[PDB]
Amino acid sequence: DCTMYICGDSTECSNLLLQYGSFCTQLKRALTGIAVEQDKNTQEVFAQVKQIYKTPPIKYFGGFNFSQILPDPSKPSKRSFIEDLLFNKVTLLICAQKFKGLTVLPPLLTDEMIAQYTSALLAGTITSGWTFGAGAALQIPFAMQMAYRFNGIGVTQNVLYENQKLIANQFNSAIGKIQDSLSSTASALGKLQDVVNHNAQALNTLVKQLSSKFGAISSVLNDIFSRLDKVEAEVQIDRLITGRLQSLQTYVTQQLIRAAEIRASANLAATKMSECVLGQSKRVDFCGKGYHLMSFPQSAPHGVVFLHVTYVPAQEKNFTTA
Amino acid sequence: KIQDSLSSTASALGKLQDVVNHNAQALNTLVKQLSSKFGAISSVLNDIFSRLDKVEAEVQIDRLITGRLQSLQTYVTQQLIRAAEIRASANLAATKMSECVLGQSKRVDFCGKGYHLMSFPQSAPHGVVFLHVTYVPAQEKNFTTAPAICHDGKAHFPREGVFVSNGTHWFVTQRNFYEPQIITTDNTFVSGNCD
Amino acid sequence: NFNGLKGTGVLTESNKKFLPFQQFGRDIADTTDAVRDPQTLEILDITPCSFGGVSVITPGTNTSNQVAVLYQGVNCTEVPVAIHADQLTPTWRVYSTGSNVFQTRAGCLIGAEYVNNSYECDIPIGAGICASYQTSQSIIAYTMSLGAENSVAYSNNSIAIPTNFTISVTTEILPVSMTKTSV
Numbered sequence: 056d057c058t059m060y061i062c063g064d065s066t067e068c069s070n071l072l073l074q075y076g077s078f079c080t081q082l083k084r085a086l087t088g089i090a091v092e093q094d095k096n097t098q099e100v101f102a103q104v105k106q107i108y109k110t111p112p113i114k115y116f117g118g119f120n121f122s123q124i125l126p127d128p129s130k131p132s133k134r135s136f137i138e139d140l141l142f143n144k145v146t147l148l149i150c151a152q153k154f155k156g157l158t159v160l161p162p163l164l165t166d167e168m169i170a171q172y173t174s175a176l177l178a179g180t181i182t183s184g185w186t187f188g189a190g191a192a193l194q195i196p197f198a199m200q201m202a203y204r205f206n207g208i209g210v211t212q213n214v215l216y217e218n219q220k221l222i223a224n225q226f227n228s229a230i231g232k233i234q235d236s237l238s239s240t241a242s243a244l245g246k247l248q249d250v251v252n253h254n255a256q257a258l259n260t261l262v263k264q265l266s267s268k269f270g271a272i273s274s275v276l277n278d279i280f281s282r283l284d285k286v287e288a289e290v291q292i293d294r295l296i297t298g299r300l301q302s303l304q305t306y307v308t309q310q311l312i313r314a315a316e317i318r319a320s321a322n323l324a325a326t327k328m329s330e331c332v333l334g335q336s337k338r339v340d341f342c343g344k345g346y347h348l349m350s351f352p353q354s355a356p357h358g359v360v361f362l363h364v365t366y367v368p369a370q371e372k373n374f375t376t377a
Numbered sequence: 378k379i380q381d382s383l384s385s386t387a388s389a390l391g392k393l394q395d396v397v398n399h400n401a402q403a404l405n406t407l408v409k410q411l412s413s414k415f416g417a418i419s420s421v422l423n424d425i426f427s428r429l430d431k432v433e434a435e436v437q438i439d440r441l442i443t444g445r446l447q448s449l450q451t452y453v454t455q456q457l458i459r460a461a462e463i464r465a466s467a468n469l470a471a472t473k474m475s476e477c478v479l480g481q482s483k484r485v486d487f488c489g490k491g492y493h494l495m496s497f498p499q500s501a502p503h504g505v506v507f508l509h510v511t512y513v514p515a516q517e518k519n520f521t522t523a524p525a526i527c528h529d530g531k532a533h534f535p536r537e538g539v540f541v542s543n544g545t546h547w548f549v550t551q552r553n554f555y556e557p558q559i560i561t562t563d564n565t566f567v568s569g570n571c572d
Numbered sequence: 573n574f575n576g577l578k579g580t581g582v583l584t585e586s587n588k589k590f591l592p593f594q595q596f597g598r599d600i601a602d603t604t605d606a607v608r609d610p611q612t613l614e615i616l617d618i619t620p621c622s623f624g625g626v627s628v629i630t631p632g633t634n635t636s637n638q639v640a641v642l643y644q645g646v647n648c649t650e651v652p653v654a655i656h657a658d659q660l661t662p663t664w665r666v667y668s669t670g671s672n673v674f675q676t677r678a679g680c681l682i683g684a685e686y687v688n689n690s691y692e693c694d695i696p697i698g699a700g701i702c703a704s705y706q707t708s709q710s711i712i713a714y715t716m717s718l719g720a721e722n723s724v725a726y727s728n729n730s731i732a733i734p735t736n737f738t739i740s741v742t743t744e745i746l747p748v749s750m751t752k753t754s755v
């Protein structure tokens with residue numbers, strides 16, 4: 056807020072603020088543009104589907120076990136088993152001292168709505184392949200669908216059927232290793248941790264900046280009137296308004312830099328979900344490390360987590376060629 | 378229908394209209410922002426020199442130079458921000474022309490919604506407009522499929538396509554268009570027994 | 573003017589635990605937030621009244637002349653505290669204990685009736701609430717709809733194959749440059 060931050064609840068300063076005038080209004084339109092954008096960054100990623108699919112009750116996908124990523128109806132929140140580990144690993148009177156016009160607006164999409172978009176992506180990518188992202192969704196057995204993911208890598212489809220049981224075990228084993236890996240350490244979620252750390256630290260310096268004299272006689276506005284003659288007191292009070300207006304300016308400029316960086320990262324998650332999730336990518340080292348097969352999305356606070364499934368050649372033998 | 382879709386609603390071109398609406402809004406604030414006083418006697422620049430002598434006139438004139446010198450710096454900084462996000466959009470339109478227009482794109486949902494065929498560029502004031510042409514499957518049916526076929530105690534796999542059956546006997550088709558074909562040694566390759 | 577403390581703000585009864593010679597109350601921003609009243613051992617915390625951001629929901633001026641008011645992050649029974657004159661700069665008292673009040677996660681808005689169907693979002697509110705001007709015309713507030721529900725009949729021996737195609741042409745607009753300026 057313009058008026059309440061610098062000399063809130065003091066009508067003898069509010070009229071002085073009209074001297075500068077349209078300086079603070081430029082700040083409101085700058086901060087309001089950031090807030091509207093944050094509601095579009097989330098829309099571009101999770102809202103790439105025109106339908107809300109849901110998985111059938113039967114959970115026999117040819118031996119593959121998807122129970123760790125599909126939603127759990129037992130929990131009050133319809134979040135999968137993996138998604139619960141993420142919500143308890145990101146740590147966010149602190150907001151009670153914000154009577155200076157500083158507020159934290161709520162996001163347009165509640166966190167129980169984003170989990171519905173993510174559950175639609177998963178339930179449509181295991182029963183219909185990639186065909187739901189380019190037209191009408193067409194069903195296909197999961198056992199046969201994985202045969203056209205090998206066929207795109209360069210390996211014939213007669214190797215999956217002859218090794219279907221072994222491949223299912225390796226997929227199931229690696230999907231349970233992620234659960235323990237996340238709960239083992241705490242530095243894996245670092246990318247989302249400093250996003251909220253930077254915003255919390257930026258506001259803190261803003262609040263502490265109004266206790267500085269700015270070289271004047273006194274920081275508090277009331278005693279300046281009672282300790283200086285009225286003929287020259289108006290010089291000192293505007294000499295203090297400049298600091299509280301420049302300080303608010305540096306905060307806004309810093310946010311404009313951060314918002315562009317997040318915008319460039321929200322445009323990369325939209326591509327990573329269009330190409331890796333809704334199809335198979337031939338770009339190397341884009342959707343993982345190796346030959347790409349498929350991916351699964353998960354929701355995290357102020358972010359998104361992918362689960363790339365790749366193909367890696369095992370032990371080799373020398374040969375002679377012509 | 379492209380001509381009539383644009384000519385009906387005028388809100389389609391809002392991506393280019395707000396680019397020119399923002400630049401005009403920034404200059405208007407800059408002009409209206411020199412009517413402030415910054416704690417001086419008056420905003421008129423030569424009224425200070427015609428009412429005060431040289432010894433306290435410099436206190437007032439300096440209070441006005443730095444005030445006006447700070448509204449220019451703010452204006453320049455915002456332009457550096459805006460120019461760095463128009464450039465991030467001119468590097469996206471320079472890629473759509475190199476890949477969607479000058480070739481056929483396999484990246485999905487990059488040059489349209491569907492299977493990309495070919496695109497055409499058109500020019501708009503302070504922008505570019507692409508006309509993507511895509512391919513979308515129409516009504517479909519559903520059949521019964523089988524991973525392989527055993528004939529002489531040996532499995533058979535499709536070279537390119539799927540196995541389907543219309544109820545009585547089987548066929549082999551494409552994956553993106555129902556064109557049934559008869560099973561033949563040409564269509565299939567053999568690998569191992571069928572147990 | 574509590575022993576040389578000057579400011580503005582309502583005085584409320586507080587129960588913080590001071591110490592034998594602790595008079596002032598200092599907050600994070602180094603501003604007074606508690607004072608020991610002279611002639612008494614009572615402690616009072618200094619805070620403004622129920623305050624925050626006031627937002628106005630409206631269609632175009634030409635379409636209609638009706639508005640709805642949303643108070644951000646306030647208990648919906650703490651808004652009618654200031655229904656008086658010469659107490660507030662905003663004296664529009666018919667909007668405080670007025671029309672159908674509905675409480676959201678971002679405060680309660682007054683002047684819009686909550687329907688319990690679901691459409692697309694027209695004017696965003698927050699936490700999954702949107703508002704629109706439908707029909708007899710009045711402003712309504714509903715919950716967003718994510719889209720049409722669907723289900724795929726999955727099976728382990730069933731496949732679907734298209735038998736026809738359609739061709740569509742789509743547009744896409746991108747800015748490439750802006751105006752050049754010299755000063």
Ligand SMILES: *[C@@H]1O[C@H](CO)[C@@H](O[C@@H]2O[C@H](CO)[C@@H](O[C@@H]3O[C@H](CO)[C@@H](O)[C@H](O)[C@@H]3O)[C@H](O)[C@H]2NC(C)=O)[C@H](O)[C@H]1NC(C)=O
Nearest residue numbers: 518520541542543544545546547548549556557558559560
């Ligand atoms: C599934 O596809 C098969 C193969 O097309 C269908 O069987 C076919 O049915 C037609 C209709 O009777 C047969 O055509 C007949 O051919 C004889 C040949 O002399 C002719 O004299 C008749 O007048 C008639 O044209 C065709 O032979 C037959 N295919 C085979 C291999 O025998 C079948 O009806 C389809 N099932 C469904 C449910 O659509």
Ligand SMILES: *[C@@H]1O[C@H](CO)[C@@H](O[C@@H]2O[C@H](CO)[C@@H](O)[C@H](O)[C@H]2NC(C)=O)[C@H](O)[C@H]1NC(C)=O
Nearest residue numbers: 114115118119120121122123136227230231234
């Ligand atoms: C998929 O894997 C999960 C483990 O992540 C299996 O759940 C376990 O099942 C065994 C035997 O049924 C129990 O002893 C464990 O207590 C279960 N663990 C958990 C965390 O639920 C699940 O059974 C597997 N899917 C199928 C179809 O068997």
Ligand SMILES: *[C@@H]1O[C@H](CO)[C@@H](O[C@@H]2O[C@H](CO)[C@@H](O)[C@H](O)[C@H]2NC(C)=O)[C@H](O)[C@H]1NC(C)=O
Nearest residue numbers: 513514515516517555734735736737738739740
């Ligand atoms: C595939 O769809 C096209 C239209 O999308 C069908 O073409 C139409 O056929 C009817 C049949 O009398 C004509 O009246 C229309 O004029 C045709 N449309 C156009 C644009 O020419 C076509 O018949 C369909 N094919 C199949 C096998 O169903």
Ligand SMILES: *[C@@H]1O[C@H](CO)[C@@H](O)[C@H](O)[C@H]1NC(C)=O
Nearest residue numbers: 630631632633634635636637
């Ligand atoms: C009046 O407002 C409506 C939208 O509320 C708009 O469609 C119409 O063009 C406006 N008329 C004017 C600005 O003359």
Ligand SMILES: *[C@@H]1O[C@H](CO)[C@@H](O)[C@H](O)[C@H]1NC(C)=O
Nearest residue numbers: 646647648649650675676677
């Ligand atoms: C508002 O206050 C009432 C009175 O205690 C309470 O029942 C209600 O839950 C409050 N609304 C909130 C906390 O959103």
Ligand SMILES: *[C@@H]1O[C@H](CO)[C@@H](O)[C@H](O)[C@H]1NC(C)=O
Nearest residue numbers: 672674685686687688689713
């Ligand atoms: C929907 O209508 C009103 C909306 O407030 C509500 O009180 C009522 O119980 C609801 N009825 C049904 C059938 O959902």
Ligand SMILES: *[C@@H]1O[C@H](CO)[C@@H](O)[C@H](O)[C@H]1NC(C)=O
Nearest residue numbers: 113115117522523727728729
């Ligand atoms: C498909 O799954 C059902 C349920 O397990 C099973 O009874 C049936 O035999 C399966 N079909 C094939 C072809 O394996």
